[PDB]
Amino acid sequence: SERNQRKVYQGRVVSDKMDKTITVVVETYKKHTLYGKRVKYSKKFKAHDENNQAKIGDIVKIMETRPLSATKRFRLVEVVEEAVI
Amino acid sequence: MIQQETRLKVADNSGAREVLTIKVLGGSGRKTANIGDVIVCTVKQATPGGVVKKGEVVKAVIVRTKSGARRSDGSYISFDENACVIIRDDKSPRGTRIFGPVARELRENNFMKIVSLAPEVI
Amino acid sequence: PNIKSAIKRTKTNNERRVHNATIKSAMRTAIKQVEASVANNEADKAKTALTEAAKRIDKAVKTGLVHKNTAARYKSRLAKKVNGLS
RNA sequence: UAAGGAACUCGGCAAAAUGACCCCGUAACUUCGGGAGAAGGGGUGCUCUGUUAGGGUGCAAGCCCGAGAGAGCCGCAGUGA
RNA sequence: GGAGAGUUUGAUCCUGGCUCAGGACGAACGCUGGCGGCGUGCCUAAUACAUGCAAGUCGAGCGGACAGAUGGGAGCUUGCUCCCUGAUGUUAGCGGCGGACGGGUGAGUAACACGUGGGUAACCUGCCUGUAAGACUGGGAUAACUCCGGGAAACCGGGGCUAAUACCGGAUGGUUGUUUGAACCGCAUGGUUCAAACAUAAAAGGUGGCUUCGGCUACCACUUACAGAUGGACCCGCGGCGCAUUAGCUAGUUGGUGAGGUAACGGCUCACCAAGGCGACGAUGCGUAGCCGACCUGAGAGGGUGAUCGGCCACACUGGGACUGAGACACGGCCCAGACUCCUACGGGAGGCAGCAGUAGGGAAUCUUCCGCAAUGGACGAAAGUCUGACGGAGCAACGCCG
RNA sequence: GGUACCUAACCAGAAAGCCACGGCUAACUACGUGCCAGCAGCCGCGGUAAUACGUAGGUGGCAAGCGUUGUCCGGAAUUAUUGGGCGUAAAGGGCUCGCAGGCGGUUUCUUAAGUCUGAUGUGAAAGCCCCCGGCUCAACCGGGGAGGGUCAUUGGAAACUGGG
RNA sequence: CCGAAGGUGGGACAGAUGAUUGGGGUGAAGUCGUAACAAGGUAGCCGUAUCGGAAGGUGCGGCUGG
RNA sequence: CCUCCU
Ligand SMILES: [Mg+2]
Ligand SMILES: [Mg+2]
Ligand SMILES: [Mg+2]
Ligand SMILES: [Mg+2]
Ligand SMILES: [Mg+2]
Ligand SMILES: [Mg+2]
Ligand SMILES: [Mg+2]
Ligand SMILES: [Mg+2]
Ligand SMILES: [Mg+2]
Ligand SMILES: [Mg+2]
Ligand SMILES: [Mg+2]
Ligand SMILES: [Mg+2]
Ligand SMILES: [Mg+2]
């Protein structure tokens, strides 16, 4: 099927305790509008992990979905990296 | 049966909410006033922004009482409360609206503007 | 109102609702019959109730009350309960 | 004890009112302890679910303590004195 | 594509503010005033409003009054009368569509409201125009009109009726649901296509003409599928205000599971579980604010503004709720409450100028109680046409820009 | 609306203005006041010879108006990213220890978030503007472009910043 | 059941106003002294304490901008 | 010790 993809993101798993759910933090370097320095921005996200596989440190990719709760808007597509301790 | 110190609800939109009876008018040692009698009174509670202000001495006509009133046919009327309407010397109400039912007795005393403005006259 | 067709639309819509409520009530009552039958363990009656339900459901769709998706949702819910009995 | 409600009186004197338990909630100010039961509110009988959950005792049977719920029932009024 | 000047001293250089020359405006006020052509004109009280007018239409749905008279009849003062229902006309009342647009105002809103972002696999989508099936067979009621009772009344309840393109019954219907499998797959939840069974679900005829009076038509038009299109709904990244002399906030709060609801995804609602979520990258609170196209200014960076004109949003005397539907949880509707206006013989009714004009009030200050749908665009209708303070014009005012 | 526009007389008749004139910024003398009366954007004028006040006569801009007050941007490299400072002009914290943060020697390999780059989609119409045309030029309307994104999506490059 | 308005209650916040009171600013020619500027006639100034109509004085420590 | 205002 020739489907246009939704906006996909990747980041570190900062939260996990919420079962069936995670917080993925897409850190990035937005330029400041006036002064032009790369400032360390960080957008948190809320994705879904049905199996409860992800943990602290996992640099997972997530893709947009139907609203899976009030805050949740994404799914755990794949655990790319698997950090431990 | 309203006497000195009786507090009344004000049944109008003049600004006064509660009045204290200073004097029953109409004779020297007159103890008690009933429906259709005029009283001098002070405003104890007022609505903020109203025409009539707290502390003003004013005339009011009693329009409902708990004691109520007897009619020549041997029937009576009573209300759950004592209430009056602030008036000018010509009997016209200082407010523009009357709240709650008033007694037929006000027609007899020629408080016509009040009787016309009242939602019910029993 | 203070318009001719407004006064008609006032008088019309009242008379429509009454008629309309009938059919919803009829539907909802017919839905309760199926729901009641699940408790008693009687599928044979639930099928014959589900037909009368489904009739009353679809009459509301025709008039312009129950949306097709709304009806779709109801007949789903009921049929799962009937099959869940057996 | 009608209506009124401190008009009484030197003075609310006397009387009335408040009053139990559980729950919510509680200001100024403060020596940071307090203030505080501040204030202001809500619940409270009986029946069934029900020898409830749970707890004590006991090998058990049993006995004892016992929330909080839901559904009802009655009265003007359930800490009905 | 970028200009400076005056002013601290007795005089000096510097630092440093202040002031001026420029442009802009919905301006106001003085004084003065000729005409013309385009444009602009409540920024204050989202204050209250007298009066009028601003959405009504379809008789080719409609029984019915009330007319029509082509003709016959018509007693007979030819003067007037008439008795039948002419083609068909006027269309209170019923039924349909529209009234959710167009118009107005920016009160609220610091929010996915907006400006630039997806599912379209989470949705909806009447009207319009296509391609694809049909209007077959049951009746039963109800306005008006009438009868009766009300209402001084305003308005209205019974009784017998009558119609409809109003409504309901049943068959067979691809839709829809369920199940039985397949086929094929995506971005996980899946999606798309096909076949049978079970279950459910359709319509409406009014005109003009021809009927071999069996019927067959055609514009309009009723109903069903796959489309396209159109207009809505949700979601998301990222953007764009002030105050820390606002540092903690939250308890349906954060996620789960289940149930319900919704066109639709979802604490959206609830039950039962846990204990989360947010925040120094400024949460929370307070203040202010419709956002955007743009506009003014400037070499530009920036700064300010968001009247007029276009788009998105929100609101409609204040506040709450649903009904009808493809679509308002309604701008000239209703239901309920509140404060105000009106009527009421007192029981009860009616309305909302942030529609055009206008009035009062506020204010430094902002128009005509105007003419016309001829034009453009709507709504209705097959059309003629009707309605249209939308709109076109004109009145007013040196308020601009320019002839 | 018998309104625009034409003809044709009465005929250039009906159609000139306001403000400013120390300096900034091109533009002066009588008289009457006498620190009074008054003036004033700033500097400042007037106490008995006022080129800035009251009056009277006299002149550069733009063109039925222009003065006055109000608001905004400029001038103001005067909140300074572009583009400023802190010995004495305003300005170094009294001095440490340090959490977060900011910043970080050299080589090499690898990565590719940042950085750069190609291609594709949208950023309505009006307005302002590039060529700009038409309406007699205008105080105005059309088309094709451009800008418009710290924006997607994808393919490269890999020095530099970041990660191993 | 939910539920607008209403009622009751105790808090929070903002504005207006208030007897009186506090300094502040400004104001051609008021009164008192003379603190500072010169070694300003006791070098001045900084912190702090205390005292005094008032500038100020005095102590302690500091600075040179003596 | 003080030295009116412009
Ligand atoms: Mg007593
Ligand atoms: Mg008593
Ligand atoms: Mg006494
Ligand atoms: Mg006494
Ligand atoms: Mg006592
Ligand atoms: Mg606002
Ligand atoms: Mg600047
Ligand atoms: Mg110095
Ligand atoms: Mg210094
Ligand atoms: Mg230092
Ligand atoms: Mg000295
Ligand atoms: Mg000395
Ligand atoms: Mg001493």
From Swiss-Prot, chain A:
* Record note on quaternary structure: Part of the 30S ribosomal subunit.
Q: What does this protein do?
A: One of the primary rRNA binding proteins, it binds specifically to the 5'-end of 16S ribosomal RNA.
* UniProt GO MF annotations: rRNA binding; structural constituent of ribosome
Instruction: List UniProt keywords, sorted A-Z.
Output: Ribonucleoprotein, Ribosomal protein, RNA-binding, rRNA-binding
Protein name, per record:
Small ribosomal subunit protein uS17
Gene3D superfamilies, per the entry: Nucleic acid-binding proteins
Q: Which SUPFAM superfamilies match?
A: Nucleic acid-binding proteins
Matching entries from NCBIfam families are given as: PRK05610.1, uS17_bact
Give a GO biological-process term: translation
What family is reported?
Answer: Belongs to the universal ribosomal protein uS17 family.
Gene Ontology annotations for the cellular component aspect, listed alphabetically:
cytosolic small ribosomal subunit
From Swiss-Prot, chain B:
MF-aspect GO terms: large ribosomal subunit rRNA binding; structural constituent of ribosome
Q: What single Pfam family name could you report for this chain, choosing any that match? A: Ribosomal_L14
Keywords (alphabetical) are: Ribonucleoprotein, Ribosomal protein, RNA-binding, rRNA-binding
What does the subunit comment say? Part of the 50S ribosomal subunit. Forms a cluster with proteins L3 and L19. In the 70S ribosome, L14 and L19 interact and together make contacts with the 16S rRNA in bridges B5 and B8.
Q: Report the protein's function.
A: Binds to 23S rRNA. Forms part of two intersubunit bridges in the 70S ribosome.
What is the similarity comment for this entry?
Belongs to the universal ribosomal protein uL14 family.
Q: What is this protein called?
A: Large ribosomal subunit protein uL14
**Corresponding gene?**
rplN
Curated annotation (Swiss-Prot), chain C:
Q: Does the keyword RNA-binding apply?
A: yes
Provide the leader sequence positions.
none
The UniProt entry, under InterPro entries, shows: Ribosomal_bS20, Ribosomal_bS20_sf
Pfam families annotated for this entry? Ribosomal_S20p (PF01649)
**GO cellular component terms listed in the entry, alphabetical order:** cytosol; small ribosomal subunit
User: Which residues fall in a coiled-coil region?
Assistant: none
The GO terms this record gives for MF are: small ribosomal subunit rRNA binding; structural constituent of ribosome
Per the UniProt entry, what is one GO biological process? Answer: translation
- Any idea which UniProt keywords this protein has? Ribonucleoprotein, Ribosomal protein, RNA-binding, rRNA-binding
Record's family? Belongs to the bacterial ribosomal protein bS20 family.
Functional description taken from the UniProt entry: Binds directly to 16S ribosomal RNA.
Q: What is known about its subunit structure?
A: Part of the 30S ribosomal subunit.
Name assigned to this protein: Small ribosomal subunit protein bS20
**Organism in which the protein naturally occurs:** Bacillus subtilis (strain 168)
Instruction: Provide the gene name from the record.
Output: rpsT
